Amino acid sequence: IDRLITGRLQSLQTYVTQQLIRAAEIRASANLAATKMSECVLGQSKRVDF
């Protein structure tokens, strides 16, 4: 039971770490989308290829 507990705990920790990294990437993309909504829908943008 201790061996199975160690294995399942390691699997759960690996899943949590991968979810944290993916959530950081998704948060960066959401910040980019919020900046695009603020600068291009609510006004006119002078930045090239933004």
Binding site: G7, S11, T14, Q18
Partner: protein
């Protein structure tokens, strides 16, 4: 090692996860190179007179 590989098969799918993560890392670097330099459609050429 046959015996060590057979004992490694008793674990989970840990090494279909590290291989899958590093492949996604390696593919992402080519996207990083493509996004920065390949911003031009046609390969322009300078005139001989400078």
């Amino acid at each position: 090692s046959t015996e060590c590989s057979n004992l490694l098969l008793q674990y989970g799918s840990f090494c279909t996860q590290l291989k899958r993560a590093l492949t996604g890392i390696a593919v992402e670097q080519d996207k990083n190179t493509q996004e920065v330099f390949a911003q031009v459609k046609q390969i322009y050429k300078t005139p001989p007179i400078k």
